[PDB]
Amino acid sequence: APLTQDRIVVTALGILDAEGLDALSMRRLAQELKTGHASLYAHVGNRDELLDLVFDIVLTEVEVPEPEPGRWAEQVKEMCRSLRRMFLAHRDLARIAIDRVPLGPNGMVGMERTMNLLRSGGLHDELAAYGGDLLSTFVTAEALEQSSRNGVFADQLHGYLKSLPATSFPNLVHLAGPITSLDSDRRFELGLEIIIAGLLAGAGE
Amino acid sequence: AMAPLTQDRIVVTALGILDAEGLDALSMRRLAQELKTGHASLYAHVGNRDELLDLVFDIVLTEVEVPEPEPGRWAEQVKEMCRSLRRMFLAHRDLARIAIDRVPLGPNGMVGMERTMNLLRSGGLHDELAAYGGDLLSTFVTAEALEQSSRAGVFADQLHGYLKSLPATSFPNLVHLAGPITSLDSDRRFELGLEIIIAGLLAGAGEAA
């Protein structure tokens, strides 16, 4: 097999999947591929450059539906859920993403389709452009937080808040559970609805 | 001259280093040098570098003003409180970097959170929406800040020029939206995202009721 960018990225993604981001060093990479450092660099560049490629390669997993009449909110949700699923299937991938702009080949194609869908809901240019950005940021941040629970810290945070003097901190005592605790699924759906409802509001008539 | 060290004098000095020189310049050694004290008395007062940063984070939160609820002005008061948080980050180099992984539950943080939740609930938000909304608002403000600081006028005109000169037959939306996707000034992005989240919160409180 000739060394290629795509072979390097497949191998890199496999290490990441089975061992996590910290295990993906260029030294480890070169060693797995049975190649030298110079070849590695020539094909993918430095570590951050390689991670840009590994991010783009997994974006094929995100499906943006073709717009349908009267289904805009559900379809935008379906797209955000597809992005969530991508992160949940690749450990530490949200760590790579939380940082980056999805402008590689698959990212471009996906952004074109995303913007098609968003504009189709009647969103003005700035709203469609910024709303795609906000939704992507939201999804990535939530996936990162879920991955961060994969304990008791959140539980000690609960006891602390619950035992505050209720006369001085009535809201923190009362909301002690929701503030510390929320299920990943429920917070994702809540945040997704909030952003979608607010985009619709901005769209107006 | 030299007064016994207090926690406050130490933190204020640390924040000064951060403001002028950034987070990497702020080591315990630099801090002890700047205070002209020994490392025992520094550590007795503020612990390790991570504990110090928890303290620097809480001290600047004094700057965030969360208003007492005013009936009929809910949406603009939430904006106001969010703009105050943004102001604070913009004032303090590298501060969103410290904030991003931290829960603001020191003194200033906990009071700020109480007042925030007071304001959110005063708008008729049910418990989960109030609690989650507070989080989503702080998360959004902090992310924006991290990135107003992570920006440059070159890179955007490159990305703009890539998008703008894409085959219009292939990428009609990317070509047409090259400006917004690439341009958006910070103020504009900030206000749009604020509008969006506040409308969605009211929308959620309104179905509720």
Q: Cβ separation of A134 and B196 shorter than 8 Å?
A: yes
Question: After which residues is the backbone of chain A broken at C–N > 2.5 Å?
Answer: 150
Element holding A84 (H helix, E strand): helix A72-89
Q: Burial of B33 by CB count in 10 Å (0-12 exposed, 13-18 middle, 19+ buried)?
A: exposed
Contact A139, A191 (CB under 8 A): no
Angle, CA A28 vertex, CA A23 and CA A31 arms, to 5°: 155
Contact B90, B52 (CB under 8 A): no
Q: Among A39, A20, A42, which Cα is nearest to A30's?
A: A39
Structure tokens at B50: 């991570």
> How far is it, in rounded angstroms, from Cα B56 to Cα B63?
12
Question: After which residues is the backbone of chain B broken at C–N > 2.5 Å?
Answer: 151
For residue A192, the chain B residue with the least C-alpha distance is B200
DSSP B67: P
Length, in residues, of chain A: 205
> How far is it, in rounded angstroms, from Cα B131 to Cα A24?
37
Structure tokens at B192: 């749009």
> How far is it, in rounded angstroms, from Cα B133 to Cα A179?
10
Contact A130, B189 (CB under 8 A): yes
Which of B117, B173, B200 faces A119 most closely, judged by CB atoms? B173
Q: Cβ separation of A111 and B189 shorter than 8 Å?
A: no
HSE value, Cβ hemisphere, 13 Å, CA-based, for B125: 31
Q: Among A126, A179, A191, which Cα is nearest to A155's?
A: A179
Q: What is the CB neighbour count within 10 angstroms for residue B159?
A: 16
Q: Among A116, A60, A69, which Cα is nearest to B170's?
A: A116
> How far is it, in rounded angstroms, from Cα B57 to Cα B62?
10
Q: Cβ separation of A190 and B128 shorter than 8 Å?
A: yes
Q: Among A199, A60, A205, A180, which Cα is nearest to A138's?
A: A199
Compute CA distances B54 → A61, A147, B48, B164, B180, whole Å: 39, 23, 10, 44, 37
B192: chain A residues, CB-CB within 8 Å: 126-127, 130, 202
> How far is it, in rounded angstroms, from Cα A205 to Cα A80?
24
For B22, residues 6+ apart whose C-beta sits below 8 A from its C-beta are: B93, B94
Q: How far is CA A47 from the centre of its chain?
A: 20
For residue A164, the chain B residue with the least C-alpha distance is B110
Q: Which region, left, alpha or beta, applies to residue B22 given φ > 0 means left and ψ of -120 to 50 means alpha? A: left
Q: How far is CA B39 from the centre of its chain?
A: 31
Task: State which amino acid sits at residue B112.
Answer: G
Q: What is the CB neighbour count within 10 angstroms for residue B80?
A: 14
Q: How far is CA B10 from the centre of its chain?
A: 23
Overall resolution, Å: 2.0
For A196, residues 6+ apart whose C-beta sits below 8 A from its C-beta are: A73, A76, A77, B200
HSE value, Cβ hemisphere, 13 Å, CA-based, for A101: 9
> How far is it, in rounded angstroms, from Cα B187 to Cα B179?
16
> B205 CA to chain A: closest CA distance, Å?
10
Which technique was the structure solved with, according to the deposited record?
Answer: X-ray
HSE value, Cβ hemisphere, 13 Å, CA-based, for B27: 5
Contact A133, A147 (CB under 8 A): no
For residue B178, the chain A residue with the least C-alpha distance is A129
For residue B160, the chain A residue with the least C-alpha distance is A103
What three-state secondary structure class fits B138? helix
For B20, residues 6+ apart whose C-beta sits below 8 A from its C-beta are: B93
Contact A29, A12 (CB under 8 A): yes
For A84, residues 6+ apart whose C-beta sits below 8 A from its C-beta are: A139, A142, A143, A188
> B149 CA to chain A: closest CA distance, Å?
13
Q: Cβ separation of B203 and A201 shorter than 8 Å?
A: yes
What is the 3-state secondary structure of chain B? CCCCCCHHHHHHHHHHHHHHHCHHHCCHHHHHHHHCCCHHHHHHHHCCHHHHHHHHHHHHHHHCCCCCCCCCCHHHHHHHHHHHHHHHHHHCCCHHHHHCCCCCCCHHHHHHHHHHHHHHHHCCCCHHHHHHHHHHHHHHHHHHHHHHHCCCHHHHHHHHHHHHCCCCCCCHHHHHCHHHHHHCCHHHHHHHHHHHHHHHHHHHHHHHC
Q: Cβ separation of A130 and B184 shorter than 8 Å?
A: yes
> How far is it, in rounded angstroms, from Cα A65 to Cα A175?
38
Q: How many CB pairs under 8 A join A and B?
A: 129
Q: Enumerate domains of chain A plus CATH numbers.
A: 1-63 (1.10.10.60), 64-205 (1.10.357.10)
Q: What DSSP string describes A11-77? A: HHHHHHHHH-GGG--HHHHHHHHT--HHHHHHHH-SHHHHHHHHHHHHGGG---PPP-TT-HHHHHH
Q: Among B10, B177, B76, B82, which Cα is nearest to A127's?
A: B177
Q: Cβ separation of A129 and B197 shorter than 8 Å?
A: no
| Virtual torsion, Cα B200, B206, B208, B209, nearest 10 deg | 170
Task: State which amino acid sits at residue B144.
Answer: E
Q: Among B59, B46, B64, B66, which Cα is nearest to B19's?
A: B59
Compute CA distances B107 → A56, B45, B61, B91, B198, whole Å: 43, 16, 9, 20, 27
> How far is it, in rounded angstroms, from Cα A76 to Cα A82?
10
Q: Cβ separation of B117 and A172 shorter than 8 Å?
A: yes
